[PDB]
Amino acid sequence: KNTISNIECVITKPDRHNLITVIVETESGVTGYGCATFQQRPLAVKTMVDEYLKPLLIGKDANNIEDLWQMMMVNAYWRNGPVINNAISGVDMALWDIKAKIANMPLHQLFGGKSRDAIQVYTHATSDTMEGLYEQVDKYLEQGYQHIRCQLGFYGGVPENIQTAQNPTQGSYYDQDQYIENTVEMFKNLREKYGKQFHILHDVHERLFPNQAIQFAKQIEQYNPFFIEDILPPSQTEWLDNIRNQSSVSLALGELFNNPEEWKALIINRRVDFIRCHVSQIGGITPALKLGHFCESFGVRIAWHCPPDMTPIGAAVNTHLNVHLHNAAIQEHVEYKANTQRVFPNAAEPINGYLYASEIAGIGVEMDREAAQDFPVEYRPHEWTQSRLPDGSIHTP
Amino acid sequence: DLGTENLYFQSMMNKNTISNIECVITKPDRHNLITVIVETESGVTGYGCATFQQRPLAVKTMVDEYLKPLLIGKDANNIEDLWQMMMVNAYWRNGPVINNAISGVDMALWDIKAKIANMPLHQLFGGKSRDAIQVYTHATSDTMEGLYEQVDKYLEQGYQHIRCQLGFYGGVPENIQTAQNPTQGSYYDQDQYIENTVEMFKNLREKYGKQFHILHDVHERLFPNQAIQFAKQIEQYNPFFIEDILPPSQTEWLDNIRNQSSVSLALGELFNNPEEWKALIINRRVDFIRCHVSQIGGITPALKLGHFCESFGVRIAWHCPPDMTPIGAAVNTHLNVHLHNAAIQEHVEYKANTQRVFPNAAEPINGYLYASEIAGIGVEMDREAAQDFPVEYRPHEWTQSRLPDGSIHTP
Amino acid sequence: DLGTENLYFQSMMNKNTISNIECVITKPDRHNLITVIVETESGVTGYGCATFQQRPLAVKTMVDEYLKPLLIGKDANNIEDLWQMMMVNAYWRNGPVINNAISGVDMALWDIKAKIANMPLHQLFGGKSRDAIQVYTHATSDTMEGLYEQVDKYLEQGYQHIRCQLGFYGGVPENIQTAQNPTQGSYYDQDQYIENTVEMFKNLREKYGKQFHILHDVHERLFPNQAIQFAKQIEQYNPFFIEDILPPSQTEWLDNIRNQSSVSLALGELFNNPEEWKALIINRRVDFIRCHVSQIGGITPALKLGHFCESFGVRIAWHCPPDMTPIGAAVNTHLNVHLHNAAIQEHVEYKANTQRVFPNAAEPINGYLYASEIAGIGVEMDREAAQDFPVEYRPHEWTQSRLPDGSIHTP
Amino acid sequence: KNTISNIECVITKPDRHNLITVIVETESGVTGYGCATFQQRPLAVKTMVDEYLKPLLIGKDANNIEDLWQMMMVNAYWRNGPVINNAISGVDMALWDIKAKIANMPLHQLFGGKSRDAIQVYTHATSDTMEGLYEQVDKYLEQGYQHIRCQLGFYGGVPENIQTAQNPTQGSYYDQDQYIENTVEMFKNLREKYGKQFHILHDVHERLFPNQAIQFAKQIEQYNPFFIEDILPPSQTEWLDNIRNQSSVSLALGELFNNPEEWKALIINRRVDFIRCHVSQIGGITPALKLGHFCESFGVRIAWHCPPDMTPIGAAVNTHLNVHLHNAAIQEHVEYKANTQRVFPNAAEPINGYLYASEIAGIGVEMDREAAQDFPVEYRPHEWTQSRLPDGSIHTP
Amino acid sequence: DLGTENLYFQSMMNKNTISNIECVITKPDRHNLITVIVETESGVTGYGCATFQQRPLAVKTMVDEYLKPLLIGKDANNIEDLWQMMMVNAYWRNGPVINNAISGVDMALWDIKAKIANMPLHQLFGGKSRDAIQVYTHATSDTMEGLYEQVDKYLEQGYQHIRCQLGFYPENIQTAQNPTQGSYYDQDQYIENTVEMFKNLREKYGKQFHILHDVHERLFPNQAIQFAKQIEQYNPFFIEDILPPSQTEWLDNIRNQSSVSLALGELFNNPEEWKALIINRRVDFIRCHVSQIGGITPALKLGHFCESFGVRIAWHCPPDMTPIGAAVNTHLNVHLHNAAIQEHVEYKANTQRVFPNAAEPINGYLYASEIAGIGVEMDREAAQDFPVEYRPHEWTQSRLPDGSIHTP
Ligand SMILES: [Cl-]
Ligand SMILES: [Cl-]
Ligand SMILES: [Cl-]
Ligand SMILES: [Cl-]
Ligand SMILES: [Cl-]
Ligand SMILES: [Cl-]
Ligand SMILES: [Cl-]
Ligand SMILES: [Cl-]
Ligand SMILES: [Cl-]
Ligand SMILES: [Cl-]
Ligand SMILES: [Cl-]
Ligand SMILES: [Cl-]
Ligand SMILES: [Cl-]
Ligand SMILES: [Cl-]
Ligand SMILES: [Mg+2]
Ligand SMILES: [Mg+2]
Ligand SMILES: [Mg+2]
Ligand SMILES: [Mg+2]
Ligand SMILES: [Mg+2]
Ligand code: NA
């Protein structure tokens, strides 16, 4: 019986992103750390943890993670969504951290142990020129990456070479046909230069309307991308059937999900090959395990969302999940910077294309509380989310 | 092109630039209520409901820290752009906290547009498609006789529809066989609830026959096999609707019910993601949609959802609980007299403190709620009154709903 | 209840009683155009489009003899009730004659409401969700070079989308192997049409590459096996859309296409019954809905259909042919800047006679149509100008479309 | 080769209804008569015939009914709907009348002859009291009817015993629950008094919302009605699946149809037992034959709509169709009055529960042109179509 | 009741009582043909086609021993009732022998009705919806140059559609040691010859004419699917009988991934064979042999059923059919709006003698007869110079290299 004695939520911005950590203290003296990172609205997550989860949780038994999760999820009656789920996730991860520490085992060992030696990793190559891409690709290949997500061009900002209306509404503009043309050209160039040296990934980032997605799938399937990610927004995934009926292209989707109705039909109908959920968005380790299991039955594999806007605690959690879950496929990775490494010591980095799970007791990564205070929250507008098409229409960003 | 430039100039002339956004939490009676206020350079002020009573400070953080700096300086006229833009602004989206904050703004923008048009809100929409909306109220008691007393009172007031509940479900497990040291929570027994409710319907029909329409809210208390059995048990009593017979995540089990029972079904007060309702409606799994307008992001998506339902022949009974501002209720009445497929409006009487903070809140008359006829929504918040009643923490222990073995059930 | 009585009194005060209904047919240029005019006691006049060019006198009989005595004395404010009531008023319903007559009234009532609100029509709806709508125009010629000439002209004007057609299809069967004494009609050969069109796409892409979006209207010329083959033949050329690849009665054959071709599809200009579009959209058989707004009964059902399409991710390209008043076109532009899922507006230049009868008709500027910014729809009919151009009988011989063996095909 | 020399459209109102007849003259001297009756909008039908069908048709070969039908149907480009279809129907029926006359055969013999001796008939018993119903039922039983459509109560007019809003909008009001209660009570009374002496039919006339229709189906299925008609409006027939899945009630629908999309899914999915199309509403004899054939394949039977608002020419056409089409089931009938019999001589009336097809050349019933002029068109508002529910909402009438 | 009896008198005065039923098998040329003749008290005689060439004595037995005593005395006017009655008369129903026998009577009854009406058959139906029906003919050879020679001839005659078959030139196939007797073929060789045939024709003639090809149920489903993808680029007007009637659900696998135009149904004699096929749009043309489904009466209904689903009609018109049957199909083809094309093979002189006035295509079109009735009858004295003769039809014992029977 391990009574929860305190709950804290710290927002820290060591580098580019507002990061959110939840800290759970227990009377047994064991402390857990969890990721609650919803970078766009961090003060709302912190309010949720401080004003609501904390008085709910203090005095309750930390051992019973499953009950505390089921209870937390329905506690406000209305449920699901990014603010509640991230707050819960931070607590849930911290609770698993504590249980693993008390067991004196690495997190993935609690789960049932390894089903692979380490998880393969992909990184990001992004440039406004092919030469910029080549330079980044060559570097990553030298470091031993076998999977690289490639993007030609940047899409947003002022509408310079775009035929807008005469007085366009303020926003971040792009042209879907330009994006398609550039991306197809990128794939053609890369295959001509590198052949089958590495797996090419690409993130469509819900930029397209359904008919454009179906066309794009047909234009790039010959290049056998390891996956094409978020080819459609979450509200339109039924359109995937048109693609699956006539194209061999490998698809990944789901980083935006925070309600189970978003993924069930998707997986039951085998509309994607990889699920890309952001663990903290779906409510933490507890539901991530069940989702991995649900996918496994249908033969869908796992590529959890691992963006720079996530703590290294969250990344370590994902690696524990990835070496355990038999249907885990690959882990997204972006290099950490000095400030972030200082606030979150011992964060693992890929080695020759692989990320290895921590082997000490717990998640294996905590937050240095003193170092975090050197980097308070800082407001950012995130102007790219005001994504507009040439006619001035908002499109899903 | 000069002509095009002139047309834009003319657009700028009729602009209503947002000058301020505020979020007030107020608790005049039992519930923490949330109002968003939007001011414009033209001096026209809008009021909207952002009420998520269980997490009000999170909604207020959302409005104050994020929606405000996003919206100041923008043209209030273009509600549709502002809604589409607000909905995706955090990238991750949907959910009760963001949707309520957005609803508060959306409703206030519609209020502003209607005031500038000098019309009641429903007239902006396209006008009335009914004279007024029928209303149901709530009768709840731990005895059948206590229920009859409340029923008799409402029938005398002219209500023709009453949501009836026999028994109270929650609290300490007094007459429930739990494990030896039950986990702290609000306990109930599903079988006792089913038994009490079936008996309630039987007794009401014996006593009142066809005098009034009987509604009942299952409130996601049941597992699917219990739901299917219950539908067969009470279908003979022809409820006007049986509400939330299953939680949002299990609505595919409604097919089993629709295939074998004639029972009339309502669902959806918990929805805050469109994936929750699309399959539900497309497959005609319910007869009434019950969404909470602020939970789905305001008037803008409510109109669309109304129209979507209408094509499938599904009707509308928006959620109108005590935990909603009278502003939200007035908005619902405007939507209800306008949308042709609206069916009925839930109502609970306002207490004096609430009436003080929100003057002119409409009450049903002979079983009908009438839409406001002055410009705008027609109901505002008294800001000075509101501040006498600041937010106050409530745990809402009923949401820790436990079954006899100590497990959580959807509350 | 006195308070309720006062509220009704207040409703009566803001009433706009219909005082007159008129229907004018006018033919300033090539087409018989139809405008409905609605007057109110308040002195506010509305204008709407009721254009069914092939049967204008039937539409006028419908307005003058039936809708007029039905509507005089009724409150114009309640567009939604008036629409629901008009739609069922003859018992039998739907169809091009009744829908157009109703559309004329519905659009004029919306015009009146917007004028009384002192807002542009799109602002009544909820405001803009785009700055302006993109526009495509028509290029048609019997030679590839003649097509390039028209294309070059439109590209210079800033169009980014052009509907292209190579060859003309109809008239006497000059180079067609018919039976010995072919029945009188407008003859064409499906295979020659397919061959010409495929070559047209190939040549345009070779000449212009990705410079502009290519549209093409199949105009229900084909049998389903021809449609499926054609989709596979031109999908590589990525048309912006292929329009009416099948007649309305054969759209289930679109599944065969959707399952094997990436081709972008548009359909629906012929619809005047909701059963024609529901399955189409629910099953995502097209990418753009193409309904003719007056054919489906006006702005009121157009808004609903827009919203319905939006939930399924289907976008909107309302039919905007020469046989429609500039009033109808302005209405379409208002719907297009408002509805978030609107995609593009078809446009053909107005001739001087037409401009005289309908002053202030908007023209595209650099490939965009901008919504009017004055109160109302923004475009009216000049009644004195209109009468210089009375109805004139036209047979429309192209609708007697025959295949080489002499059989009728959907025209 | 039989050239069309003239086309005329006469509206006549010998009794209660504006009736519409189309007359086609041919150079061979043979004259055809057809029904185009859309009683609510007769001047629009007449305009359509006079101003559009006539100049299209004069000079064309009357023999080729199939081509003339296909051609007429698409002639305005936009198509289907009650005004165009009724005008076409009048011409189509008149063309078949001419062909039968030239063949010197009764219409049904042209078709392929009889597949039954005569068609069974039902009539209408309607009263605001049960005693009124009993009196009408007893009469019809005595005349040898074995099928009677029964209705208790009248639904419309001023809202006397209805709880409306305080100032209800002008219209024709009814209460759906009152209607259901009365109708169930009617069935119970009739079965108690008459047992299985006759088949009971009832017309719901689209008065109900879907959940009310499903309930009503369950409340009356025990009474084994011969059919329940129009239990739902045409836009909601997909709801019939809920009924068909759980109720044995026999259903009829379709009098409102004037677009084939309205009936195809209905019949393919066996959602009704009888189709009730109004022949002139679907465009005449030509499409009625095809529809009968289409239904036959699916096992759906035919009860063509035969209301008082139809010429006796139209009724005779329906009897010719009914003795020919093997899946025809029953013919609705209402007695003709003196004025109507004068304008349309020799109209057949049921005999001992049966209607017999005409046996002279042609349809067998024509219009007396002189007698029709004594009864010009007269405007009627048809106020019942402004049908409102207690809250003042329009409902499908 | 008086008025009803008076109606019953007028009907009686117009009744046309069947007085005799006859069935003649005749073999003027290559095929045993079957004609039913119905006589009436009117003195009006009708002729119909009952041709099931492989089993003609069974059909004749069916007519002479069973339909004849059933029909004598009954009113010929009521074709619909007599059809419904005949179809269920042996309780067990459907099938090629019963349906052909019934078809002969049915067509003959329509012939009589049209003669009494003094109208061409198609005019009874409601008249023309086209001027004439386009025609395809048969080009068959064991060499490409033989094919070219026939194609060139037909093109000069004005045909725009040609069914092309390139056959083999079990002596060259790898069978087992002592192959069971039968008519052997190799599916892979057939597929290869056919693909190369299409390729050559398009190379040589481009889009000069529409190419049709009859697979004649020779393939397994995986081979049918492959073949569809192999020839779809050549845009055949239709590929006929790509699968046997029992395996048509496999057509979905084709429809989901190929644009190939398909026709099927000449083998059908039971409605259950075509309903799902049409409801699910699994073919583009229905190919039913009219006498196999039981005559004009059900052909009219089937055409209407097809029309609703957008399926078009190409009735089976082989050489093993009377010219009476062919004329009936042309009447059906000029009337039904969804009729597409009529198969035709040239009549030889003996057949012309037995069936005078049989129409031939003119410039790629067949014109419906314009006299009263079907327009073609059998000359009974000439028919008896050509009595039935037994033929084994050894091609129906169709075997694969391993000795297995395959659908022929
Ligand atoms: Cl930023
Ligand atoms: Cl755009
Ligand atoms: Cl109080
Ligand atoms: Cl509480
Ligand atoms: Cl509580
Ligand atoms: Cl339990
Ligand atoms: Cl000009
Ligand atoms: Cl013309
Ligand atoms: Cl023309
Ligand atoms: Cl043709
Ligand atoms: Cl009346
Ligand atoms: Cl009501
Ligand atoms: Cl010869
Ligand atoms: Cl042989
Ligand atoms: Mg991504
Ligand atoms: Mg509830
Ligand atoms: Mg078009
Ligand atoms: Mg009826
Ligand atoms: Mg064959
Ligand atoms: Na496919």
PDB file of N, CA, C and O in Angstrom, chain E residues 60 79 90 93 112 121 175 234 279 293-294 296 323 356 384 386 394:
ATOM      1  N   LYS E  60     -38.625 -32.225 -78.357  1.00  0.00           N
ATOM      2  CA  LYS E  60     -39.793 -32.643 -79.119  1.00  0.00           C
ATOM      3  C   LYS E  60     -40.736 -33.544 -78.300  1.00  0.00           C
ATOM      4  O   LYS E  60     -41.960 -33.394 -78.360  1.00  0.00           O
ATOM      5  N   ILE E  79     -51.286 -14.830 -73.149  1.00  0.00           N
ATOM      6  CA  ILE E  79     -49.915 -15.332 -73.130  1.00  0.00           C
ATOM      7  C   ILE E  79     -49.306 -15.328 -71.733  1.00  0.00           C
ATOM      8  O   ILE E  79     -48.604 -16.272 -71.351  1.00  0.00           O
ATOM      9  N   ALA E  90     -44.992 -28.915 -64.513  1.00  0.00           N
ATOM     10  CA  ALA E  90     -44.418 -30.214 -64.133  1.00  0.00           C
ATOM     11  C   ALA E  90     -43.911 -30.191 -62.700  1.00  0.00           C
ATOM     12  O   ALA E  90     -43.216 -31.115 -62.282  1.00  0.00           O
ATOM     13  N   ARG E  93     -39.140 -27.365 -62.320  1.00  0.00           N
ATOM     14  CA  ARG E  93     -39.213 -26.377 -63.379  1.00  0.00           C
ATOM     15  C   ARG E  93     -37.816 -25.842 -63.695  1.00  0.00           C
ATOM     16  O   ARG E  93     -36.815 -26.305 -63.123  1.00  0.00           O
ATOM     17  N   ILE E 112     -48.848 -15.196 -83.156  1.00  0.00           N
ATOM     18  CA  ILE E 112     -50.300 -15.148 -83.352  1.00  0.00           C
ATOM     19  C   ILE E 112     -50.915 -13.812 -82.919  1.00  0.00           C
ATOM     20  O   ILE E 112     -51.711 -13.219 -83.659  1.00  0.00           O
ATOM     21  N   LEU E 121     -44.105  -7.698 -84.645  1.00  0.00           N
ATOM     22  CA  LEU E 121     -43.957  -8.045 -83.233  1.00  0.00           C
ATOM     23  C   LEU E 121     -43.479  -6.879 -82.372  1.00  0.00           C
ATOM     24  O   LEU E 121     -44.071  -6.592 -81.323  1.00  0.00           O
ATOM     25  N   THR E 175       0.319 -34.401 -72.022  1.00  0.00           N
ATOM     26  CA  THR E 175      -0.700 -35.118 -71.272  1.00  0.00           C
ATOM     27  C   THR E 175      -0.034 -36.227 -70.487  1.00  0.00           C
ATOM     28  O   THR E 175       1.169 -36.455 -70.619  1.00  0.00           O
ATOM     29  N   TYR E 234      -6.504  -3.264 -74.489  1.00  0.00           N
ATOM     30  CA  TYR E 234      -6.967  -3.324 -75.879  1.00  0.00           C
ATOM     31  C   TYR E 234      -8.422  -2.909 -76.048  1.00  0.00           C
ATOM     32  O   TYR E 234      -8.922  -2.842 -77.173  1.00  0.00           O
ATOM     33  N   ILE E 279     -27.682  -7.555 -60.170  1.00  0.00           N
ATOM     34  CA  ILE E 279     -27.847  -6.674 -59.021  1.00  0.00           C
ATOM     35  C   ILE E 279     -26.489  -6.089 -58.622  1.00  0.00           C
ATOM     36  O   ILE E 279     -26.375  -4.912 -58.299  1.00  0.00           O
ATOM     37  N   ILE E 293     -34.366 -19.333 -71.556  1.00  0.00           N
ATOM     38  CA  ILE E 293     -34.996 -18.749 -70.374  1.00  0.00           C
ATOM     39  C   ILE E 293     -36.513 -18.821 -70.495  1.00  0.00           C
ATOM     40  O   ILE E 293     -37.241 -18.410 -69.583  1.00  0.00           O
ATOM     41  N   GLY E 294     -36.988 -19.317 -71.637  1.00  0.00           N
ATOM     42  CA  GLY E 294     -38.405 -19.626 -71.792  1.00  0.00           C
ATOM     43  C   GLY E 294     -39.230 -18.717 -72.692  1.00  0.00           C
ATOM     44  O   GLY E 294     -40.469 -18.664 -72.574  1.00  0.00           O
ATOM     45  N   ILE E 296     -40.152 -15.090 -75.269  1.00  0.00           N
ATOM     46  CA  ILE E 296     -40.285 -13.637 -75.285  1.00  0.00           C
ATOM     47  C   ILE E 296     -40.765 -13.089 -73.950  1.00  0.00           C
ATOM     48  O   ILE E 296     -40.268 -12.063 -73.476  1.00  0.00           O
ATOM     49  N   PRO E 323     -33.898 -19.097 -87.855  1.00  0.00           N
ATOM     50  CA  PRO E 323     -34.072 -17.703 -88.271  1.00  0.00           C
ATOM     51  C   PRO E 323     -35.311 -17.071 -87.631  1.00  0.00           C
ATOM     52  O   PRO E 323     -35.409 -15.838 -87.575  1.00  0.00           O
ATOM     53  N   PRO E 356     -37.950 -19.129 -95.111  1.00  0.00           N
ATOM     54  CA  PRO E 356     -37.911 -18.045 -96.104  1.00  0.00           C
ATOM     55  C   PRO E 356     -37.967 -16.638 -95.491  1.00  0.00           C
ATOM     56  O   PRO E 356     -38.588 -16.432 -94.431  1.00  0.00           O
ATOM     57  N   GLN E 384     -39.144 -31.156 -94.070  1.00  0.00           N
ATOM     58  CA  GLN E 384     -39.108 -32.614 -93.976  1.00  0.00           C
ATOM     59  C   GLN E 384     -38.120 -33.274 -94.934  1.00  0.00           C
ATOM     60  O   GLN E 384     -37.888 -34.479 -94.851  1.00  0.00           O
ATOM     61  N   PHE E 386     -35.154 -32.397 -94.625  1.00  0.00           N
ATOM     62  CA  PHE E 386     -33.989 -32.344 -93.742  1.00  0.00           C
ATOM     63  C   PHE E 386     -34.296 -32.852 -92.331  1.00  0.00           C
ATOM     64  O   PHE E 386     -34.313 -32.070 -91.372  1.00  0.00           O
ATOM     65  N   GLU E 394     -18.593 -33.682 -79.961  1.00  0.00           N
ATOM     66  CA  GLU E 394     -17.453 -34.155 -79.180  1.00  0.00           C
ATOM     67  C   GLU E 394     -16.685 -33.048 -78.470  1.00  0.00           C
ATOM     68  O   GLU E 394     -15.974 -33.310 -77.497  1.00  0.00           O
TER      69      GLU E 394
END
